[PDB]
Structure formats: structure tokens, C-alpha cells
């Protein structure tokens, strides 16, 4: 039969009847380029640290929506303050720079 | 000098340090555990094992009738069958057809294999902690004793006092109660004395397996004899000291964590991972050499060669040095980046020097200590080519061991870009926030 | 028949009951304990006595010098001292007036009265709990034996199976630590081994009385020989076990709490009262008489003929009964109230008996269960005359064992009106609410 064992860096011992138990540990030699691309950085780091590979790069995306929404939010009341003075004025100066920054 | 700090409960592999006294030149100090072992302190509850029967010659009463009576035996057994007719090889043994009784006995013993083959069943209690400690420092060679791992009980190892502070674990593998059988252990809650079940583990209890008082809790009945037949017939649960063997199930020695290796004269665990030891060594002031009496170091350059973070010692380093006084000069790694190999150097006036060193950081960056001077190495590391090794690793890995120069700025990026877009949404809100109060003003 | 109940943790005083099995006359249960031992398992540490110091012959080199050299002795000194000019009986004993040399040694040991005068120092652990049981039930005279307090273990009395309960309290007089001298016990905190202090208890350690490693720690410095005379003089600080010995204090004998006794052989603490002990007695069943077989009592009156509530049996109390087949009835009260001190009393076809019983209360009530019936016994104690009494009370006294009637009345009255004067004035506010509601509609 053919038996499949998991070994961390902490070891794993084995004894195969009547012989001295074997201790074995296993290198930290997942594949992967830390130094490549985005995917193959991703890639070695979820080879070496699964669920803190998936727990981070959730963590990462939620940052990012929620900074990028809140940013384009407050951009958003940015221009529907800056802007709604002169729309209720039809008659009103509208500086150029204004047309550059708030819009 | 006394040297304090703070060493992992590991058994081979070694402590390293320089033991720096004011006014004299850093010496290297080497501790190796050999062995660590856990003893705790038992208490022999009682011994388990096979029983035997003892059946004596039964009584046959011709022509009349006997009565039984009670007896100090272990599950004693009595009846007087009446109506019997036995034979012998001579005949009948008995005149009468009916009017005869056989009393049969029967009661149990500890079997003669007990002496040899029997579990002994403990109550175990924290005792004591000792460990082989392998010492060498400066030019002194290794030198060993047994000391007691409590932090009080100094040890005299080569002219220096050691002693080794408690545990930081209480952690022991052993249950308040184990079964010894043989060479195992078990983590078993043994029934108290008196209260063994039949066919179960302590149908039979001894409190010595030498003692004259035993308990045995088996269904021993006696049966009625054969027609004809001078016999004592019985019935009885089977041994449960037999039956537990069978259903024993995996030893202690074999699922303790933390690789305990357990071991029975004293009983103990020994080499258990667990915590840290404390440690406190007095070096010979005669150790010590003056640091206007030792080489001069100067000019120090450290490229690391190659480096890959194995277990082992994968890295080469190699230093370039100006000196003076050419002589022995120790080498050092302050930090847990690296573990280095090497423990001195020879040095000459001028020259280069190399070392190996195993650390477990993809991009390893420690100061290296040179006898009174110090050099920052930095390289890039290679994966390990080997899945799995036979030897534990000499280095400890980090939470940022990991983290390469790109994951880093990634990582940079990241945090950065997401901040910058916060702060310009709140600057475009100062910025407007100003001109609707100076709309009004 | 198993009878379980929890008793308390006394010596001397009985714990009494009627064992009530359906369709059988009840039987009188009386378990007295005779002594109750704590056990503690002991890991002997290390022995201390006072030490004796050894001294060689010195060595006197004329015209020369000699070297001394390390040997193992425990606190072994040596030294050498030149320019002596030694005389004897015979005259000078060196040629040369400056030249010569003495070399001195001494070291510790053992003295001989370590034998028989030393200190054990042990670890205390949880050990077990014994103790010796009287026993009597029905018409059976009083047995008894020793047994193991563990609420597992079964004990044969006079073919009643006892199983007895753990101890409520874990409580235990003994220390982690203990030193045990003599025929005293001290609950000391003594250092560790190898860590004695001179002129203090750990001065001088041995892990046993015939050990060859002993440790040994006193101030021993070998002092000059006096001009012209041959001996070997030193200093040393004066013994720690003999200081010890004036300044060790009251032993663990004379502060136990719950009056515990303190034992050696084995270390133990004897009747410290703490606590109940649950109890599980098997009658067997040739005990017990068939209802149908037993005399029937009827129409009991009770009489408190005399009563006060001392710690004896100062109850005296008469029943008036009536009864068939005149024979012997059991005599019990289940009641917390009254102990009993007859347990059974010979019945007529009618008349009266009487019995004597401990109370606490000063107005007793309580049932009395004159066999297959009962009776309620009420009457007035008076106050003891005695102060001071060198026996325990028989009785239990309770929150309101000594609440007379006169303080009920007052007690009833003060609650009862003031109660009663703030509902008066809620009943008031109530209606005069109404009254008011009345005028507008
Ligand atoms: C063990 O792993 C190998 C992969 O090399 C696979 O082919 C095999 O089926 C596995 N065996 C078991 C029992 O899982
Ligand atoms: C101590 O270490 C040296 C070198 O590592 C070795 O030769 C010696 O056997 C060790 N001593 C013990 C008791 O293991
Ligand atoms: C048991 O009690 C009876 C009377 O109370 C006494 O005679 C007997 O000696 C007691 N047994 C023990 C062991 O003290």
C-alpha cells in the first residue's frame, strides 16, 4: 500500500514495524517566484501560507473598496458642492479654473 | 563573570553567544542540551495481571452428604452437588445410587507468569526536571554534566557554574494516571483498587506482586460434574489483562506531542519541545583576555556568496578584513536572522575569511560580530531544492522571513495608493469646505 | 439493601439512621468513626543534620614548600603556609628557621549523630484518605475495619459492604513543602538543594543519610598555625541545623487547624474535622424482618419530661404507647433537632418508655419514629450550667436553634407591624386617589 503523510517544519516521526522510529521535516520549498509578477507572487506566497494568502488578499480587496468608494464619494460631494453654487445662478462668473478642478 | 539569557528547549541544537565581560575581549560560549528529561513522581496503585485458577482435590462423600463453608480466598467458590455417581479407573467409587454429594472449591491466584508479565498501575504526581548539558566556551573543549532544570541547583561543568532555569512549560505528557506494561506507557484511568469489572482490566488487582492479600472479580461458578465422571467443572469470565493487550491501542510512546520519547527506569519523558530555559553560567575570570591583549579588527567587508534558506547551513559568506596581531578571533550573529557555523576565525594582518551560515529570510540581512568589531551582511537567498530533510533547521523562521523585496513593495504600494486616494478626496473637501464659507464671506 | 446518606466528618461522634425497606421493618444504622487519616504521598528531598568537620594530618615540609591541589571533598579547603618553625615534644622539628612549609586541609562531613539527629526535607502531594469504621446494625454487634475514604472502594464489616465517599473538603494541613524532625512537622519552605546558605537550615544537604554526595556550605577558612606550634586551626560559621533547632518555631503539631493530630509512620494528619463524607452501606438482607412479623405501635404521646440543652444528652423525654405482639422497637428521630441517644426500646402491650436525647434548640420539636410509626415531641430547654465541658456536643445547632418564643413574638411583632403601618398608609394614598377621582366625576 502507499501511504500519504503531511510533514510541517515541526517534523513528523514514522515507525515501520519493529524498525528505529524516522523523523523527517519537510523544507520550505513551495513553487513559486516571490520576485516575478503579480500572479507568481501570489502564487508562491499561497503555496507557503494558504489560508493567510486568502484571509490577506480579502483583506487587501475590502481595503480597497472601501478607500476607493469613500474617495470617489467624497469627489463626488466634492463636485455637488463645489459646483451647486453656481447652478442655481445662471447668471454667475463660472471661472475657468473652476471647470478644471471641480468638474 | 555570570552570563544570563534566555536558550530554546531544544536537544541538539546548540546555544551560541559572546559572553562580553568590561575590559576583556568577547568570549564564545557553546551550550548544547544532550537530553532533557521530565520525572515526575509515582505512586504504585496496584499491579494487574493474568489470573489462574487453583481448583484442590474435590471432596466425594458416599453414602452421605458435606456442607460447604466460606474460606479468605480470592473469589472463593463452594457448592456440594448431590446425587452423583462417580467412577474410577477401579469402578464405582461410591456404594450408594443416590445418597452421594461432591464438594467442588475453586478460587483465583496471580498465575506464575505475573512475576514477569503484569501492568503496573500509578498515580503520578510533578516531580523533577533534569537534562545532560554539553558546555564548551573560549578554548576550553566540551565537558558535560546532569543538572536540574529549576533554576536554583547550581552544576560544576569544567570550572563553570551552570545553572538552568525552570521550564517556562509546565507541560508533562503523563495523566494523573498511567498503566506501565512492558516498555509503554498508557494515559489510562484505571479503575481504583477493589472495584474491577470481570473480563475488564482490573478483574485482578495486587497492591505488590509479591503481597498476600488479592482481589479478583471474575464470574468463577463452579458447574455440576459430568455423570460418572470426578471432576470440578467451572465457568469463568476471561482474563481481562489478556483482552486489554488485545485492545491496549497506542501507547503514550507513541502519540506524546511535542516529540516526547518516553522511557521507564525512572519513568520519564524525555526531549519534550516545550518553552524555553532560562539559563545562568559563571565563566572562569581566567577565561578572559584583555582588549589591549587581543587583535585589532578594522575595515570590515561581508558579501555573501551563496545562500539558500534550508535547514541547514546553506549560506557561504565572506569577509574581507584588516588586521593587526594576527590571531584566533571568535565569530558571532547577535540577531536570529542567522545561525552561524563557524565559532572563530583566524585572522591576519590583512586578508578575507569565510563562513556558513543558515537562516531561513529570503533576503537575510544580520550584523556579524568580529572579536570586538562588527560587519552588516546582506544577500539574496534561494528556495531549498530538498521537500523534506531528516534533521531539524538550525535557524528560526519570522512572521517577515518570507516577505521578499517585491511582496514588500507590493505591500508599500498598497498602503500608500490607498492613503493617497483617501487624502485627496479629504483634501477636496477642505478645499471646497473654504470656499463656501468665503462664498457667504 | 444499599443505604446512602452523607455523614459528617467527626471522630467520635455516631452517625445514626433506620434503614427503610419496602415491605421490611426498618433496621437501626449506626456508623461511627473510630479515626480519619490524610495521607499525603512524601518525596524525600534532601536530609540535613549538623555537620562535623575533618581534619587531616598537615603536612609539614622542612626546608621547602609543598602545593596544594583540588580534591572532592564537600567544602574541601586547603592551603599552604610558609615560614613556620614547628616545635614538638622532641624539639624543633624543622632544620631551616624561614624555609619550611605546613600545608593544611579540612573539609566537611557527616557527623555521627546525623544518624539518629537529622531534619528530612519533603514534597508533599496529594496522597490518600483512610480511616477506621465502627459499625453495628439491627442486632449486630458493633464491627469494624479500616478503610480507603474513596467513594469507590468497598469494605466487608460484618457482612456489610461499605463504600465511602471522598472527603467534601480537599483540605490538607500539609504544605507543598515540609521539613519533618523528630516527632514534629514543619510546614518550612527550605532551599533547594545545592543552595543551602552557611550558618543557615540548608547549610549542610545529603539526598540521603548514607549518601557520598554531600553538599556543604559554611564559611570553613583555614587560619595560620600559631609560632612554633603544630595543628591545623580554621574558622567556620557556626552550624545552621543547630541554629535551626532554637529558632525553628511551633511545629505543624501545635497549629494545625480542625484539631488535626500529625503522624510520622506514615506522614499523615489524623481527625481533622472538615467537611461530610458521603457514605453507601449494603444491609444484607438477612437484616430485615417482614412488616407482617414486627409489633404495631399506635396512639404515641410524647413528653418532654426534663430538658436542657447541653452538650450531653440532657433531654429526658417520655412516650405513652400502645403495642401488639409486645416486642423490641427501633427508636430513631430523622430530625436535625434531637439526637438520640437509645437506639431501640423493648415494647410492652401498653404503657410508656423513656428516652434521652442532645438537643441545641431551646424550644425542641421533633419526630420521633418509634419503629413503623412516629411521634412529635415538643418542649422547653433550659440553659446549661456548665461553661466549660471537656467533650464535643452530640448536637448540631442551627441559625435559629436559640430564638425563643418571646423572641419570635417580638420578632413577628416588629415585622409584622411596621409592615403592616406602610401598607396602612399605601392602602390611605389608594383610596384618598379614588376620592379625589370621585369629586370630578
Ligand atoms: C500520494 O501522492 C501521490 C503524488 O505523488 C499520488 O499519486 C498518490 O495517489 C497519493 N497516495 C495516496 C494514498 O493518497
Ligand atoms: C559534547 O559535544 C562533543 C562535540 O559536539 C561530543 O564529542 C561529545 O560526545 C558531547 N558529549 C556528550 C555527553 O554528548
Ligand atoms: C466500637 O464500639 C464499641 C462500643 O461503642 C466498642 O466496644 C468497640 O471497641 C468499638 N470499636 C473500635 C474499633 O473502637
Known sequence: TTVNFTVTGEGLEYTWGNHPPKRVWAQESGEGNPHGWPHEVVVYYYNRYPLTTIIGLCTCVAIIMVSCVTSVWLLCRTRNLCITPYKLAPNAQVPILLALLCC | ?441
Open chain 2, 1 to 441: 563573570y555570570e552570563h544570563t539569557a534566555v536558550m530554546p528547549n531544544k536537544v541538539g541544537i546548540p546555544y551560541k553567544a559572546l559572553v562580553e565581560r568590561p575590559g576583556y575581549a568577547p568570549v564564545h560560549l557553546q551550550i548544547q542540551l544532550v537530553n532533557t528529561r521530565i520525572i515526575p513522581s509515582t505512586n504504585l496503585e496496584y499491579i494487574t495481571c493474568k489470573y489462574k485458577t487453583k481448583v484442590p482435590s474435590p471432596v466425594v462423600k458416599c453414602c452421605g452428604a458435606t456442607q460447604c463453608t466460606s474460606k479468605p480466598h480470592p473469589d472463593y467458590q463452594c457448592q456440594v452437588f448431590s446425587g452423583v455417581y462417580p467412577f474410577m479407573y477401579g469402578g464405582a467409587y461410591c456404594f450408594c445410587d443416590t445418597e452421594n454429594t461432591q464438594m467442588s472449591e475453586a478460587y483465583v491466584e496471580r498465575s506464575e507468569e505475573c512475576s514477569i508479565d503484569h501492568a503496573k498501575a500509578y498515580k503520578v504526581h510533578t516531580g523533577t526536571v533534569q537534562a545532560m548539558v554539553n558546555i564548551t566556551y573560549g578554548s576550553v573543549s566540551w565537558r558535560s554534566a546532569d543538572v536540574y532544570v529549576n533554576g536554583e541547583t547550581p552544576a560544576k561543568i569544567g570550572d563553570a557554574k551552570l545553572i538552568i532555569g525552570p521550564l517556562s512549560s509546565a507541560w508533562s505528557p503523563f495523566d494523573n494516571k498511567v498503566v506501565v506494561y512492558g516498555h509503554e506507557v498508557y494515559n489510562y484511568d484505571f479503575p481504583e483498587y477493589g472495584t474491577g469489572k470481570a473480563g475488564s482490566f482490573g478483574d485482578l488487582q495486587s497492591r505488590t506482586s509479591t503481597s498476600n492479600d488479592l482481589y479478583a472479580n471474575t464470574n468463577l461458578k463452579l458447574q455440576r460434574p459430568q455423570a460418572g465422571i470426578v471432576h470440578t467443572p467451572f465457568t469463568q469470565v476471561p482474563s481481562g489483562f489478556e483482552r486489554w493487550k488485545k485492545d491496549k491501542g497506542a501507547p503514550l510512546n507513541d502519540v506524546a506531542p511535542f516529540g516526547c520519547s518516553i522511557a521507564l527506569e525512572p519513568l520519564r519523558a524525555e526531549n519534550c519541545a516545550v518553552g524555553s530555559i532560562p539559563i545562568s553560567i559563571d565563566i572562569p575570570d581566567a577565561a578572559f583576555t584583555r582588549i589591549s591583549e587581543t587583535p585589532t579588527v578594522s575595515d570590515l567587508e561581508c558579501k555573501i556568496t551563496e545562500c539558500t534558506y534550508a535547514f541547514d547551513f546553506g549560506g557561504i559568506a565572506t569577509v574581507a578584513y584588516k588586521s593587526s596581531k594576527a590571531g584566533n578571533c571568535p565569530i558571532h550573529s547577535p540577531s536570529g536572522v542567522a545561525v552561524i557555523k563557524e565559532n572563530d576565525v583566524t585572522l591576519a594582518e590583512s586578508g578575507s575569511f569565510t563562513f556558513h551560515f543558515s537562516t531561513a529570510n529570503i533576503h537575510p540581512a544580520f550584523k556579524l560580530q568580529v572579536c570586538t568589531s562588527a560587519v552588516t551582511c546582506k544577500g539574496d537567498c534561494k528556495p531549498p531544492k530538498d521537500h523534506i530533510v531528516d534533521y531539524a533547521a538550525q535557524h528560526t523562521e519570522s512572521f517577515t522571513s518570507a516577505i521578499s523585496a517585491t511582496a514588500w513593495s507590493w505591500i508599500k504600494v498598497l498602503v500608500g495608493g490607498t492613503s493617497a486616494f483617501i487624502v485627496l478626496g479629504l483634501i477636496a473637501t477642505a478645499v471646497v469646505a473654504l470656499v463656501l464659507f468665503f462664498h457667504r464671506h
